[PDB]
Amino acid sequence: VCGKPKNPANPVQRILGGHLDAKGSFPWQAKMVSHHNLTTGATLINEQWLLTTAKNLFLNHSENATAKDIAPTLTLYVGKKQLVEIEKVVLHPNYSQVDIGLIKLKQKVSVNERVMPICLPSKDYAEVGRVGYVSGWGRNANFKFTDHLKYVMLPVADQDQCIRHYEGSTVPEKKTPKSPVGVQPILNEHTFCAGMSKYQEDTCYGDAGSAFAVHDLEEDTWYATGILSFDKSCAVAEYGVYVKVTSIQDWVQKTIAEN
Amino acid sequence: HLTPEEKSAVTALWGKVNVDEVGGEALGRLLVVYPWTQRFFESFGDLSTPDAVMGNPKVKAHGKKVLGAFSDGLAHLDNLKGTFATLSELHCDKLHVDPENFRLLGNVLVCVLAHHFGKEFTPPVQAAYQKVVAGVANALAHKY
Amino acid sequence: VLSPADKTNVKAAWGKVGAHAGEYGAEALERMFLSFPTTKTYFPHFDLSHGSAQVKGHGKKVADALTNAVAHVDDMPNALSALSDLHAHKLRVDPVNFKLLSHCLLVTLAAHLPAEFTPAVHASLDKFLASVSTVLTSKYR
Ligand code: HEM
Ligand code: HEM
Ligand SMILES: *[C@@H]1O[C@H](CO[C@@H]2O[C@@H](C)[C@@H](O)[C@@H](O)[C@@H]2O)[C@@H](O)[C@H](O)[C@H]1NC(C)=O
Ligand SMILES: C[As](C)(=O)[O-]
């Protein structure tokens, strides 16, 4: 039912950085398209609901739009370019702090080798140095939305290092906007950063909404530990910034139970 | 695809390329400019600095092969897909090469042509070569 | 972010470019327009013919902006803030285009200054232009 891909990600070379999705190892990955043709990510978390970010949902909308305004302007696909119809969108009620929304489908998907949800974790797998896999449909080294799925293999990074990188200091009165790309991520106790100093393939525009997936080797199950929020690093800034799934778990479960 | 005028400017230029050198210089530059690509070529030995890369004889030799495939593409602009189907399959299934890099190598090749030909590498001849690199990249991506 | 060694490569290569920067800018635009015709749609008000004086004028502004970025490589976002709002918000230039213009600048340098266009310098410039291109697109929405 979740987190058991037929062909789990298994790179030949265990090198942190970019890899082709050669085996089709991310059946939880979805592709969202905005009303002005911008590709973003979403993540299937059960048969009828996806996570994505609030910023993704707001593309091409007024900062005053509601879930009802947004929902009928989106297009969503799973598997081999399979359009699925959306019933509604639910914004996180504190989305300026926790960059998240949920998407409900009008009907359950049929699960198979290309379409399958990832499991939501109760354990917090985000220890510094934890190796995960982040798939995405974002822009590549030519700044084109990728035609074929790709992933990055990356460690969770030290939170203070990442805060100093983008904000200069952990101390509120010493902070300055230091982001190397000229836009600031949402960084707080609800997020983690991932990456290492390396000229690499990095996540970039459109990858947000995708999962930082961790493979629990005892259960042999795949879990969404983070949802990528800050997809603008693009090998210029050093870290992606991810919403911690454990920090929204209760809100996700209530929402799904209610709708 | 290529006007016959463009086909003409292209083969005119290609006929002057040092077949034994430009392929190694394009591959060599791909590996220096986009260093993540070096992981595919551990059986070439020493790639650890730009001189190591640019003077490595296996780079030069493999370069010849890549150039040779571009020569094939020139002969078959009408069927780049068929011509590159086996190569597409090798790079995808066996090698796991991200298809974004085909365009990067293409572009590095264009840079090398500009580097060697200077002013003869005019904007219109560039434009025609850009059609060729894109066409070669799409065909190499086609079995993905 | 660029290493110290990259920054040194960029500053030196671009110091040699010196007063040619405008002409090289203009030629890079001309290559972009002809190789990638879709880029011409951002300039429907221009004379885009070969040798257009309006293109030479614009090439000079593009050059001055890059010169200013090179002068302020540790503080690029700030130095380019006005331009970044211009490109991302007002003009809505798709990110792909920045890789087209970047490539055409590189081609132009290679064709004009082959002695300076070594592999290492090529790498440092590509990285520099990829940082400029990222700053100018990070606000794109
Ligand atoms: C237009 C672009 C390219 C062309 C025309 C090209 C062409 C070729 C050719 C002709 C061969 C020899 C195949 C054979 O013996 O059957 C080959 C092998 C190979 N190519 Fe490419 N290729 C391209 C791009 C790339 C890129 C971007 C990468 C890696 C980043 C790559 C990695 C390889 C590798 C690892 C091999 C195996 C070489 C060996 O085993 O010694 N290629 N390619
Ligand atoms: C390295 C990349 C680039 C740099 C440094 C750059 C720089 C500039 C500069 C300095 C201006 C003039 C602003 C002024 O007069 O106040 C400008 C305007 C403009 N740029 Fe760019 N630009 C770049 C890339 C692009 C690309 C890729 C496109 C489109 C394909 C583009 C389209 C425009 C347009 C349409 C204008 C307005 C022209 C006008 O005033 O009528 N730019 N850019
Ligand atoms: C959404 O946020 C609500 C308000 O946040 C809380 O109260 C404010 C004044 C601050 O003290 C803040 O740090 C506290 O978190 C929460 O009460 C509510 O639980 C949050 N909702 C969810 C679903 O996470
Ligand atoms: C590999 As690191 C924490 O210096 O980005």
Rounded to the nearest angstrom, the gap between the alpha carbon of residue A7 and the centroid of all alpha carbons in its chain is 20
Instruction: Among C61, C92, C107, C125, name the best residue to mutate to test ligand 2's pocket (greatest count of ligand atoms within 8 A of Cβ).
Output: C61
C-alpha–C-alpha distance, residues A46 and A108, integer Å: 9
Range of the domain at C65: 1-141
**Interface contact flag, C107 B114, Cβ < 8 Å:** yes
Structure tokens at C38: 């879709």
Q: Among candidates A46, A55, A96, which has minimal Cα distance to A209?
A: A55
For A123, residues 6+ apart whose C-beta sits below 8 A from its C-beta are: A216, A223, A246
DSSP for residue C1 = -
Residue carrying structure tokens 């609800």:
A190
- Which listed ligand is nearest to A157 at the C-alpha? 4
DSSP for residue A40 = E
Task: Judge if the beta carbon of residue A93 lies within 6 A of ligand 3.
Answer: yes
Given the DSSP bridges, would you call strands A82-84 and A86-91 parallel, antiparallel or unpaired? unpaired
Query: Is any Cβ of chain A less than 8 angstroms from the Cβ of B103?
Result: yes
B101 to each of B37, B83, C132, how far by Cα in Å? 8, 19, 21
3-state SS track over A87-130: EEEEECCCCCCCCCEEEEECCCCCCCCCCCCCECCCCCCCCCCC
Q: How far apart are the first and last CA of chain B?
A: 23
Closest Cβ–Cβ partner in A143, A235, A238 for C96: A143
Give how far A141 is from chain B: nearest CA, Å.
7
C-alpha–C-alpha distance, residues A32 and A49, integer Å: 13
C-alpha–C-alpha distance, residues A239 and A236, integer Å: 9
Contacts of B99 in chain A (CB under 8 A): 20, 147-148
Give how far B32 is from chain C: nearest CA, Å.
7
Kindly report the CATH number assigned to the domain that includes residue C19. 1.10.490.10
3-state SS track over B50-110: HHHHHHCHHHHHHHHHHHHHHHHHHHCCCCHHHHCHHHHHHHHHHCCCCCHHHHHHHHHHH
For C129, residues 6+ apart whose C-beta sits below 8 A from its C-beta are: C102, C105, C106
Query: Is any Cβ of chain A less than 8 angstroms from the Cβ of B94?
Result: no
Structure tokens at C20: 């040619």
Chain B CA closest to residue A16: B36
Query: Is any Cβ of chain B less than 8 angstroms from the Cβ of C5?
Result: no
Q: How far apart are the first and last CA of chain C?
A: 23
C-alpha–C-alpha distance, residues B86 and C71, integer Å: 48
Closest protein CA for atom 39 of ligand 2: C43
**Interface contact flag, C112 B118, Cβ < 8 Å:** yes
Q: Which residues line ligand 4 (CB under 6 A)?
A: A 157-158, 161, 195-197, 238
Contact assessment for residue B31 and residue B37, using Cβ atoms and an 8 Å cutoff: yes
Give how far C32 is from chain B: nearest CA, Å.
9
DSSP for residue C94 = -
Q: Which atom of ligand 2 is nearest the CA belonging to C69?
A: 5
Residues after which chain C has a gap (C–N > 2.5 Å): none
Query: Is any Cβ of chain A less than 8 angstroms from the Cβ of B93?
Result: yes
Kindly list the domain boundaries of chain B, sorted by start residue: 1-144
Contact assessment for residue B1 and residue B78, using Cβ atoms and an 8 Å cutoff: yes
Structural domains in chain A plus CATH codes: 1-26+118-248 (2.40.10.10), 27-117+249-259 (2.40.10.10)
Q: Which atom of ligand 2 is nearest the CA belonging to C105?
A: 1
A57 to each of A76, A101, A172, A257, how far by Cα in Å? 12, 8, 29, 22
Closest Cβ–Cβ partner in C95, C134, C140 for A236: C134
Structure tokens at A206: 């459109």
| Burial annotation A162-183 (CB, 10 A radius, 16+ → b, else e) | bbebbbeeeeeeeeeebbbbbb
Rounded to the nearest angstrom, the gap between the alpha carbon of residue A44 and the centroid of all alpha carbons in its chain is 11
Resolution in A: 2.0
Give the torsion through C-alpha atoms of A247, A252, A253, A254, to 10 deg: 110
Domain tally for chain C? 1
What is chain A written as a DSSP string? Answer: --S--SS----SS--SEEEE--S---TTEEEEE-TT--EEEEEEEETTEEEE-HHHHHTTS-TT--HHHHGGG-EEEETTTEEE-EEEEEE-TTTTTS--EEEEESSPPPP-SS--PPBPPSS----TT-EEEEEE--B-TTSSB-SS-EEEEEEB--HHHHHHHHHS-SSGGG-----TTS-----STTEEEE--S-S-----TT-TT-EEEEEETTTTEEEEEEEEEE---TTTSS-EEEEEGGGTHHHHHHHHHH-
- Which listed ligand is nearest to C1 at the C-alpha? 4
- Which listed ligand is nearest to B87 at the C-alpha? 1
Cα C60 to ligand 4 centroid, rounded to whole Å: 39
C-alpha–C-alpha distance, residues C33 and A70, integer Å: 36
C119 to each of B34, C10, C123, how far by Cα in Å? 11, 13, 6
Q: Among candidates A73, A89, A79, which has minimal Cα distance to A30?
A: A79
Q: Which sign does the torsion angle of CA C126, C128, C132, C134 carry? A: positive
Q: Among candidates C14, C106, C138, C34, which has minimal Cα distance to A204?
A: C138
Which CATH class, in words, describes the domain spanning B1-144? mainly alpha
Chain A CA closest to residue B99: A148
Structure tokens at A136: 């995405």
Query: Is any Cβ of chain C less than 8 angstroms from the Cβ of A237?
Result: yes
Rounded to the nearest angstrom, the gap between the alpha carbon of residue C75 and the centroid of all alpha carbons in its chain is 17
Q: Which sign does the torsion angle of CA A38, A39, A42, A44 carry? A: positive
How many alpha carbons fall within 13 Å on the CB side of residue B18?
11
How many alpha carbons fall within 13 Å on the CB side of residue B133?
24
Task: Judge if the beta carbon of residue A251 lies within 6 A of ligand 3.
Answer: yes
Give how far C112 is from chain B: nearest CA, Å.
6
Contacts of A183 in chain C (CB under 8 A): 138-139
| Burial annotation C120-141 (CB, 10 A radius, 16+ → b, else e) | bbbbbbbbbbbbbbbbbbbbbe
